[PDB]
């Protein structure tokens, strides 16, 4: 399934992933595409801050789901 990440202005990012992919891995894919270091990125979905030891299914994320992200002008 494809997921979307929005930046400061709400930019749209399409990624190819597998349900078995880890969140750290997803961050790595974002780094490759946008140059944002993984330590400066916080992932949030379904109102709860996504944890690195949990899976997408645990957060009931379905196909074409979109997450929300911040840039980093002050404190992300």
């Amino acid at each position: 399934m494809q997921i979307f990440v929005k930046t400061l202005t709400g930019k749209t990012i399409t990624l190819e992933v597998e349900p078995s992919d880890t969140i750290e891995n997803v961050k790595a894919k974002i780094q490759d595409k946008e140059g944002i270091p993984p330590d400066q990125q916080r992932l949030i979905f379904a109102g709860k801050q996504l944890e690195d030891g949990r899976t997408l299914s645990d957060y009931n994320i379905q196909k074409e789901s979109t997450l929300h992200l911040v840039l980093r002008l002050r404190g992300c």
Partner: protein, 62 residues
């Protein structure tokens, strides 16, 4: 009305001390608008003042 009320669909969590902590299901009164970059703002919640990304929120049409 004069000010705009916005409901936040994507709640965050206490990121910093200078940042305002907002949870889903709360209304924050917009104190003052941000510069050019659309994605930042400031509001008061729980007796605090801090900035937060407005992307995580949508505008209610009425």
């Amino acid at each position: 009305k004069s000010k705009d009320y916005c409901k936040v669909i994507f709640p965050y969590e206490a990121q910093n001390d200078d940042e305002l902590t907002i949870k889903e299901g709360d209304i924050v009164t917009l104190i003052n608008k941000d510069c050019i970059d659309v994605g930042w703002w400031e509001g008061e919640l729980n007796g605090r003042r801090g900035v937060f990304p407005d992307n995580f929120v949508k505008l209610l049409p009425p």
